[PDB]
Amino acid sequence: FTMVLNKVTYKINAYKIKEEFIPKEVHFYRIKSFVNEAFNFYRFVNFYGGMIINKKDKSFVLPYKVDNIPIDIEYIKSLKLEYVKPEIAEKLVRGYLKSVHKIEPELSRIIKENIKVESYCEYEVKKHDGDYYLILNFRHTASITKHLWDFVNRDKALLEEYVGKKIIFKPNPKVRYTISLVDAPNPQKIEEIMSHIIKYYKWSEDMVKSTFGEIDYNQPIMYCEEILEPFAPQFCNLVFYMDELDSYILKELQSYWRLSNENKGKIINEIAKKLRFIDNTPKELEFMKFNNTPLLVKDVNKNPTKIYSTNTLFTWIYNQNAKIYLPYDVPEIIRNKNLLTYILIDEEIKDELKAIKDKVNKMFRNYNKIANKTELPKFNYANRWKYFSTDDIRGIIKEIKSEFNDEICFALIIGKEKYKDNDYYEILKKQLFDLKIISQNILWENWRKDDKGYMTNNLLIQIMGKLGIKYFILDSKTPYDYIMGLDTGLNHRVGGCTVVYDSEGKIRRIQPIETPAPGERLHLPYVIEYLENKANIDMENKNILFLRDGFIQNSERNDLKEISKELNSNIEVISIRKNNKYKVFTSDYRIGSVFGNDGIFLPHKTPFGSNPVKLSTWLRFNCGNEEGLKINESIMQLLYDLTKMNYSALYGEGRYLRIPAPIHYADKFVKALGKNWKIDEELLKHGFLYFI
Ligand SMILES: [Mg+2]
């Protein structure tokens, strides 16, 4: 039991709901009276804080008794809340608090340059032990007041860099969409879009000019995730969360936006104090601490050696006494090859050419002297030093294209802090890859101050990853033959991606997934069928763990039961949610806990406040059976170990990822494909993270 474990106690944003606000009984009802096709049964029960039992029998459950728009209903049974499954009971208490006790209007009352910032509370109820807790989160939603088209400096390329961002169509800021695709500019469609919204809002033609301004004809025809209708970037606004922003952005802002987890806790406690439904004290929870799992690399004699961090992987570049580390595997496509390298320097930093040259040379000459007489490829950048401007990316692309390589090349981009314009560097990488040039950008200001070799080490880690080099592996082998990260973006040709990891934690495949057919969703049973039949991955007599930011539908459960017996494989699935309502009032990290069946995962150190990752519904399909597994120390350690299989050393908060590498990279590939990056089959098969 818990009396022998290394536990650290920490406060979370869970507050005990008072007795008077917990329903004693749940009540079963069915619609006895007639209902038409436009009835919308799900909305009807959801409004009255209920839940559907059977859609066909029009049966539901309410957290209260109704003594009689609402139609005539038939009472079936009453049941003590205590006899109800914890997951069902939590939602019924939420519905009771929402519908009967009006928690949403009371919460609004408590909380009542070109950025419009809005504040809101989000709530959920959790059953922990025999008690119900309200999860209380306070969020800040900011909106760019300047519209999407002018914001992106009227450039179709900059617009593509916004795929995966949240938007609102100006008149309705209550509907939040996600950019998933673009299209060529058309003056005919621009007229057609305007004419539709004039009709919907009963507008005069004058209204469009008044609302959106001087309309752009050569404007792109944007498209979105939820609605098949065409979008006009001039008519939309970017919407984001202040806590979803990167650390670098946060530094320039005032203290309130970079607040610590402890200080964020003090704000939550203030809302809890004014809320009559809950006790004021936050829930104290016991947390396990994850082990700092070692990594394996090869030594100069190609023998495995224990390493605890990648912070010393390329320390031998500067330090002559530092231990030389060699990769586990280099793909056959780039094995001991002289890669035609390009050195791209931003025009605005031309004065520091002497310091730039001496930095690129001292790094590559020390790398090449070791890359020679080993599997590692060499970088040959002789006479391929070129200047570029962010104002004309197309100009420098026309200069490179003139040289027909038709082979794998590299480009080291030396840039400067241009803020929003930093997306032009991402435009350069994307367009460079269309020409088969893998590239990495670095900010000169930061690299110039790197006297310890820290950034050089991180730059080389990222270059290795982009070249699909399996530098380091996990010291501990898992029961799983495969750990598969899955993201399902799309109603289009390619609807998703699976990033396949082996038992050692190395990328075996970056597998794009084609959607089944028009008018149907990309479900887990179909992904498995696709991997076996169209991707050529042997998935029989295997132990496979799937990682997804999503829940399994009821229809999938039986198909997954059949697939497990058909493959003679153990198929597991766990839900990993980066966007959740939990908050841990601490600056500590490498910690995990379980709150009413949910795993609360806090892996990485952060400069400012950090949000935990929620782990939910760990399922097992084996021998035609379905089994719900309890989130434990074993999986959390495995998930933590997977946040360490990072080659994105130059990005994010520190060395390790917030979310495990298989799911993290699946999401990054889906975004990259949305921004119209090229799909290079050979490279993805070899695990090249060229899109990072
Ligand atoms: Mg209170």
Curated annotation (Swiss-Prot):
<dbReference type="GO" id="GO:0004520">
    <property type="term" value="F:DNA endonuclease activity"/>
</dbReference>
<dbReference type="InterPro" id="IPR003100">
    <property type="entry name" value="PAZ_dom"/>
</dbReference>
<keyword id="KW-0378">Hydrolase</keyword>
<feature type="active site">
    <location>
        <position position="520"/>
    </location>
</feature>
<dbReference type="InterPro" id="IPR054436">
    <property type="entry name" value="Ago_PAZ_methanocaldococcus"/>
</dbReference>
<feature type="binding site">
    <location>
        <position position="440"/>
    </location>
    <ligand>
        <name>a divalent metal cation</name>
    </ligand>
</feature>
<feature type="binding site">
    <location>
        <position position="487"/>
    </location>
    <ligand>
        <name>Mn(2+) 2</name>
    </ligand>
</feature>
<dbReference type="GO" id="GO:0051607">
    <property type="term" value="P:defense response to virus"/>
</dbReference>
<feature type="binding site">
    <location>
        <position position="692"/>
    </location>
    <ligand>
        <name>Mn(2+) 3</name>
    </ligand>
</feature>
<dbReference type="Pfam" id="PF02171">
    <property type="entry name" value="Piwi"/>
</dbReference>
<dbReference type="GO" id="GO:0044355">
    <property type="term" value="P:clearance of foreign intracellular DNA"/>
</dbReference>
<feature type="site" description="Interacts with gDNA">
    <location>
        <position position="200"/>
    </location>
</feature>
<feature type="domain" description="Piwi">
    <location>
        <begin position="409"/>
        <end position="678"/>
    </location>
</feature>
<dbReference type="Pfam" id="PF22138">
    <property type="entry name" value="MjAgo_N-like"/>
</dbReference>
<dbReference type="GO" id="GO:0003677">
    <property type="term" value="F:DNA binding"/>
</dbReference>
<feature type="region of interest" description="Binds 3'-end of gDNA">
    <location>
        <begin position="196"/>
        <end position="201"/>
    </location>
</feature>
<feature type="active site">
    <location>
        <position position="487"/>
    </location>
</feature>
<keyword id="KW-0464">Manganese</keyword>
<protein>
    <recommendedName>
        <fullName>Protein argonaute</fullName>
        <ecNumber>3.1.24.-</ecNumber>
    </recommendedName>
</protein>
<keyword id="KW-0238">DNA-binding</keyword>
<feature type="binding site">
    <location>
        <position position="667"/>
    </location>
    <ligand>
        <name>Mn(2+) 2</name>
    </ligand>
</feature>
<feature type="binding site">
    <location>
        <position position="462"/>
    </location>
    <ligand>
        <name>a divalent metal cation</name>
    </ligand>
</feature>
<feature type="active site">
    <location>
        <position position="549"/>
    </location>
</feature>
<feature type="site" description="Interacts with gDNA">
    <location>
        <position position="140"/>
    </location>
</feature>
<dbReference type="GO" id="GO:0046872">
    <property type="term" value="F:metal ion binding"/>
</dbReference>
<feature type="binding site">
    <location>
        <position position="487"/>
    </location>
    <ligand>
        <name>Mn(2+) 1</name>
    </ligand>
</feature>
<keyword id="KW-0540">Nuclease</keyword>
<feature type="site" description="Interacts with gDNA">
    <location>
        <position position="174"/>
    </location>
</feature>
<feature type="region of interest" description="N-terminal domain">
    <location>
        <begin position="20"/>
        <end position="112"/>
    </location>
</feature>
<dbReference type="GO" id="GO:0003723">
    <property type="term" value="F:RNA binding"/>
</dbReference>
<feature type="region of interest" description="Binds 5'-phosphorylated end of gDNA">
    <location>
        <begin position="440"/>
        <end position="443"/>
    </location>
</feature>
<feature type="site" description="Interacts with gDNA">
    <location>
        <position position="648"/>
    </location>
</feature>
<keyword id="KW-0255">Endonuclease</keyword>
<feature type="active site">
    <location>
        <position position="667"/>
    </location>
</feature>
<feature type="binding site">
    <location>
        <position position="466"/>
    </location>
    <ligand>
        <name>a divalent metal cation</name>
    </ligand>
</feature>
<feature type="site" description="Interacts with gDNA">
    <location>
        <position position="98"/>
    </location>
</feature>
<feature type="domain" description="PAZ">
    <location>
        <begin position="147"/>
        <end position="240"/>
    </location>
</feature>
<keyword id="KW-0051">Antiviral defense</keyword>
<dbReference type="InterPro" id="IPR036085">
    <property type="entry name" value="PAZ_dom_sf"/>
</dbReference>
<dbReference type="Pfam" id="PF22333">
    <property type="entry name" value="Ago_PAZ_arc"/>
</dbReference>
<feature type="site" description="Interacts with gDNA">
    <location>
        <position position="462"/>
    </location>
</feature>
<feature type="region of interest" description="Binds 5'-phosphorylated end of gDNA">
    <location>
        <begin position="604"/>
        <end position="611"/>
    </location>
</feature>
